[PDB]
Amino acid sequence: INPVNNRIQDLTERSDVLRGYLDYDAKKERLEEVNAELEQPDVWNEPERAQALGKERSSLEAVVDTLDQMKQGLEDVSGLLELAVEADDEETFNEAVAELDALEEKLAQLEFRRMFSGEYDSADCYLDIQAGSGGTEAQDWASMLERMYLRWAESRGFKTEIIEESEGEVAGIKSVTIKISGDYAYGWLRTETGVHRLVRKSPFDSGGRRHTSFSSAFVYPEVDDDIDIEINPADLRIDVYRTSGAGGQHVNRTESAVRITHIPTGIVTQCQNDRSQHKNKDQAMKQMKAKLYELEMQKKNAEKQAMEDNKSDIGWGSQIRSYVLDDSRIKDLRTGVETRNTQAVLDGSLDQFIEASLKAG
Amino acid sequence: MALNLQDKQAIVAEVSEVAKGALSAVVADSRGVTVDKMTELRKAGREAGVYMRVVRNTLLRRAVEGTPFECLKDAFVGPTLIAYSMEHPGAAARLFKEFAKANAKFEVKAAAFEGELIPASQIDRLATLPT
Amino acid sequence: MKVRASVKKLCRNCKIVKRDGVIRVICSAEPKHKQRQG
Amino acid sequence: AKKVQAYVKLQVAAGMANPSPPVGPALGQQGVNIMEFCKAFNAKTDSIEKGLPIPVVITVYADRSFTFVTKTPPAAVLLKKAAGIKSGSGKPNKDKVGKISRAQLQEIAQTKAADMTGADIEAMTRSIEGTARSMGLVVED
RNA sequence: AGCCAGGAUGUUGGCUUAGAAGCAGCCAUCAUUUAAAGAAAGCGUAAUAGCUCACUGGUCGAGUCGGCCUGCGCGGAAGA
Ligand SMILES: [Mg+2]
Ligand SMILES: [Zn+2]
């Protein structure tokens, strides 16, 4: 009896899923297609193609060979454990532990590769949550959702910084922006962008009347201080002005917002870190470009990046979550992962939806 | 390079070679190709390494300076690139017949080689010497 | 050829020449180094 | 007939032949049949350890006759196998790898001079240690 | 200063999970044989065939190579 073998059983079935993700058949089919095209006598005569054919080769060789490394590797680890239990070699028991873990460390190498983290997915990011309509019901949902995310990253260890927070009227905000410092911080949060539906009996009306509130959240990364493509001039606009009341221990003890707009395509960012006007406008233009950066990536998806124009515009990830409090049923509209624990996911038990969003993102 | 200070030490090393040696034999790499180099280096590092230095400093004031102690008749072999090679472990060894065999192997163009008169012989390659 | 008030050897093959008093700078390598005046 | 017509050096593996995938460009520009090159190394590699890095030397004659000669594995990878740590040196004497005894160096230098040339085993050991200090490898006796 | 040659074996050059047969990035910078050869001067480059400078010998066999203090000149200097 060995629970390590019970993990070898678990890792192998997961490996079948890891093979089930990448379409392991077509991986070996395409890799031989790069092989046949390099036999072509004009490899040296097509230089740019040659560096590209090697690029198509080397990118798959780090995956297909690893997939075959996990194939023949696991079969030997399947041998080294069962030989150890049936012969009682204490070192063979000790070595098989390192033999199983390294395969998971290859599964961990596939983990970031399956996540296909590119541009700024390994970097920190910013949040942007807007309140819906209907007075106090919307701002509470703005608040309760935001303060769930604030209690979320603290459990994961991501440093949180409220860049800007604009309180609506009665217990809640209308817009908020939070900087999330962390490794792969954009990677764990990118897929949460969209509109989040709240369904509950409102506490604001006598009787009952289950009310449906809406609120959206927008996650845009940190663009490495410069994208390397500055589209600055672009009808720039500064509007720096005093904010609500600095009452007692109000946010950052600043009340000095820097409202900056990007008139073409209508992008609006703002910052409320410090009293130094020149400091905030420096930080706000950083996120203005980042918000402009996510606009540039959506255009690729708008053509032929990941939409698959088959019949029509296959997408519209606006309604991505539904939070029904009085039925205790949280449903994700992108995968269908459901959970019957409201206060747990109101505390930050969102890993079940991250893996759900990791699949289609 | 330098003055007489560095110029003599190479000759003093040749003085160390004439201390117990005999039958100096020479070659001529005035035009020596890569393989004429590849032979004369890889063979020189692996044959003995001690006497197979290619001392082609054959000026009539430089190589003549090498021989005021053993066989001053070797002062005649100044011109037409000359690189001395005595034999330290074997007095009058195979390295008289060997260079002729080197010319019978790859060294076709080395047209000034004769070998010196320690045992009083020249140009004509010999084999009645203990190889 | 390049014309300047200050001419100098840009490479190792280019040499100096005083053709008809006019200081020139011929070059056996890249013709981009041919200079005049100076 | 004569010396050479097409002189190359290839094969960074010891049991993996594969004519067309990695060697394909260096076969057609050298007048080499793929399966002939695939099996000629296999005609030699069975007696030596397979999977390791062992180079080759190819000479082509004017009558299309391929004569192949193997060499010794490099210093930087064999010592990487002698130490077992797959690393180099990003920074010279900052990215350190691990120590190698002169007794470990003695078996190597005697083998590096078995397929290649040299004069002294210790002089070859200094050459290995010269490349060792060049790879960020700490060396002991 | 030319005319003739070498410019090699070294670790097929090692590491940022792109590649480097003296040359794009980061590096070293220790040798071997050493008359002497730097992982280096410029290009041919998916590291594709090579020719040369460093340094060193043979022949001719005399002076030569630069820097500085300065006299007098040249170019820079095109208008109605
Ligand atoms: Mg003047
Ligand atoms: Zn020039």
Phi, psi of A28 (to 5 degrees): -75, -20
Element (H, E) at B61: none
Spatial neighbors of A99 by CB under 8 A, at least 6 apart, are A76, A77, A80, A81
Return the closest-CA partner of residue A153 out of A181, A195, A191: A181
Give the whole-angstrom CA distance, residue D73 versus residue A209.
Answer: 80
Alpha-carbon torsion, ordered A164, A165, A168, A171, to 10 deg = 180
Distance CA A193, CA A217 (A): 5
Helices (H) and strands (E) in chain A, counts: 8, 15
Cβ under 8 Å to D: B residues 24-53: 42, 45-46, 49
Q: List Cα–Cα distances, A66 to A51, A117, D16, in angstroms.
A: 22, 18, 17
* DSSP SS3 for A361: coil
Report the distance separating Cα A215 and Cα A194, nearest Å: 9
Q: D91: which 2 tokens?
A: 């920074």
In three state form, how does the secondary structure of B93-130 look?
CCCCHHHHHHHCCCCCCCCCCCCCCCCCCCCCCCCCCC
Q: List the end-to-end C-alpha distance of chain B, in Å, as a whole number.
A: 38
DSSP conformation class of D47? S
Name every residue whose Cβ is closer than 8 Å to that of residue D3 and which is 6 or more positions away in sequence: D59
Q: How far apart are CA B88 and CA D96, in angstroms?
A: 45
Q: Hey, are the CB atoms on D25 and A44 less than 8 Å from each other? A: yes
Q: How many Å does it take to go from CA D127 to C1' E71? A: 61
Q: Please, are residues A125 and A193 in contact by the beta-carbon 8 Å criterion?
A: no
Single-letter code of the amino acid located at D28: G
Q: Is A171 helix (H, G, I), strand (E, B) or coil?
A: coil
Token output for A117? 């983290």
- The closest of A108, A109, A124, A268 to A190, measured between CA atoms, is A124
Give the residue among B23, B30, B128, B5 at the shortest CA–CA distance from B71.
B23
d(CA D135, CA D71): 21
Q: At what angle do helices A47-85 and A90-114 cross, to 10 degrees?
A: 150
Q: Which SS3 state, helix, strand or coil, does residue A46 take?
A: coil
Q: What whole-number distance in Å separates Cα of residue D130 and Cα of residue D91?
A: 16
Is A31 within 8 Å of A65 (Cβ atoms)?
no
Q: How far apart are CA D120 and CA B46, in angstroms?
A: 9
| Residue with tokens 């990003």, as numbered in its chain | D90
**Is B74 within 8 Å of B117 (Cβ atoms)?**
yes
List Cα–Cα distances, A191 to A217, A320, B69, in angstroms: 10, 10, 92
- Ranges of CATH 3.30.1550.10 domains, chain D: 7-71
| Contacts with D21 from chain A: Cβ below 8 Å | 35, 38
Read off φ and ψ for residue B22, nearest 5 degrees: -160, 155
| Contacting partners of chain A (3+ CB pairs under 8 A) | D
Residue with tokens 């080395």: B110
Nucleotide nearest to D12 (CA to C1'): E12
Interface of A with D (CB under 8 A): 35, 38-39, 41, 43-44
User: B105 touching D, CB under 8 A?
Assistant: no
Could you tell me which residues come within 8 angstroms of residue A24 by beta carbon, excluding any fewer than 6 positions away?
A67
What's the rounded Cα separation, in Å, for the pair D45 and D33?
19
Of A106, A17, A123, nearest to A66 by C-alpha is: A106
Report the SS3 class of residue B91: coil
Parallel/antiparallel/unpaired status of strands A194-201 and A241-242: unpaired
CB neighbours of B71 closer than 8 A, spacing ≥ 6? B24, B116, B117, B118
Report how far apart, in Å, the C-alpha atoms of A317 and of each of A321, A340, D27 are.
10, 23, 52
Nearest to D55 by CA among D4, D116, D5: D116
State whether residue D82 is helix, strand or coil. helix
> Could D118 and B45 be called an inter-chain contact, meaning their C-beta atoms sit closer than 8 Å?
yes
Q: Which experimental method was this entry solved with?
A: cryo-EM
Answer for the pair B107, B81: CB distance below 8 angstroms, yes or no.
no
Contacts of B65 (CB under 8 A, 6+ apart): B8, B11
3-state DSSP call for residue A179?
A: strand
Task: Quote the CA–CA distance of B42 and B58 in Å, as a whole number.
Answer: 23
How far, CA to CA in Å, does A28 sit from each of A188, A234, A334? Answer: 30, 48, 30
Establish how many alpha carbons lie within 13 A of residue A161's alpha carbon, considering only the half-sphere containing its beta carbon: 15
Domain segments of chain B as ranges: 1-130
Q: How would you label A30-50 residue by residue, b for 16+ Cβ within 10 Å and e otherwise?
A: ebeebbeebeeeebeeeeebb
State how far the Cα of A106 lies from the Cα of D43, in Å rounded to an integer.
35
d(CA D36, CA D59): 14
Ligand 2 centroid to Cα of residue C13, in Å, is 6
Structure tokens at A288: 């203005």
Tokens of A106: 């290859």
Other residues' Cβ atoms within 10 Å of the Cβ of residue B102: 19
In chain A, which residue's Cα lies nearest the Cα of D23? Answer: A39
C-alpha dist (Å) from residue A208 to A5, A136, A170, A197, A213: 55, 16, 20, 19, 15
Name residue A94's amino acid.
N
| Residue set of the binding site of C | 11, 14, 27, 33
Chain B environment of D119 (Cβ under 8 Å): 45-46, 49
Between strands A236-238 and D6-8, the pairing is: unpaired
Q: Is D117 on the interface with B (CB under 8 A)?
A: yes
- Show which positions of strand E are touched by protein (CB under 7 A): 4-19, 21, 25-37, 41-42, 45-48, 50, 55-61, 74-77
Structure tokens at A218: 């927008």
Sign of the C-alpha dihedral, residues A37, A38, A39, A41? Answer: positive
DSSP one-letter code for A337: -
- Give the minimum alpha-carbon distance from B77 to chain D in angstroms, rounded to a whole number: 30
How distant is C1' of E55 from CA of D114, in Å?
31
Distance between CA A306 and CA A361 in Å, rounded?
Answer: 10
Helix orientation angle between A47-85 and A3-22, rounded to the nearest 10 degrees: 160
CA gap B74, A184 in Å, rounded: 81
For residue B9, what are the CA distances in angstroms to A282, B3, B5, B12, B81?
Answer: 72, 11, 7, 5, 20
Q: Is there a contact between A60 and A29 (Cβ–Cβ < 8 Å)?
A: no
CATH code at B1-130: 3.30.70.1730
Where residue A210 falls (left for φ over 0; alpha for ψ -120 to 50; beta otherwise) is beta
Interface residue of B35, B43, B46 to substitute, partner D, most D CBs within 10 Å: B46
Task: Give me the CATH topology for the region D72-140.
Answer: Arc Repressor Mutant, subunit A (1.10.10)
Superfamily of domain covering D7-71: Ribosomal protein L11/L12, N-terminal domain (3.30.1550.10)
Long-range contacts of A150-153 (CB under 8 A, 24+ apart): A150/A178, A151/A347, A151/A348, A152/A347, A152/A348, A152/A350, A153/A180, A153/A182, A153/A348
**A39 alpha-carbon distance from chain centroid:** 41
- The greatest distance separating any two alpha carbons of chain A, rounded to the nearest whole angstrom, comes to 82
A278, two tokens: 């020149």
Phi and psi angles of residue A49, each rounded to the nearest 5 degrees, phi first: -70, -35
Enter the resolution in angstroms: 3.2
Between CA B2 and CA B19 the distance in angstroms is 26
- Identify the H or E element spanning A257: strand A256-257
CB A212, CB A199: distance < 8 Å: yes
CA distance D33 to chain B (A): 29
Query: Chains touching chain B at 3 or more Cβ pairs under 8 angstroms?
Result: D
Contact D117 B45 (CB under 8 A): yes
How far is ligand 1, taken at its centre, from the CA of residue C14, in Å? 26
Residue burial A329-342, b: 16+ Cβ < 10 Å; e: rest: ebbbebbeeebeeb
Encode burial over A210-220: b for 16+ CB neighbours within 10 A, e otherwise.
ebebbbbbebb
- Bridge partner list, A198: A213, A323
Are the C-beta atoms of residues B40 and B29 closer than 8 Å to each other?
yes
**CB A335 within 8 Å of CB A359:** yes
The burial class, CB within 10 Å (0-12 / 13-18 / 19+), for B31 is exposed
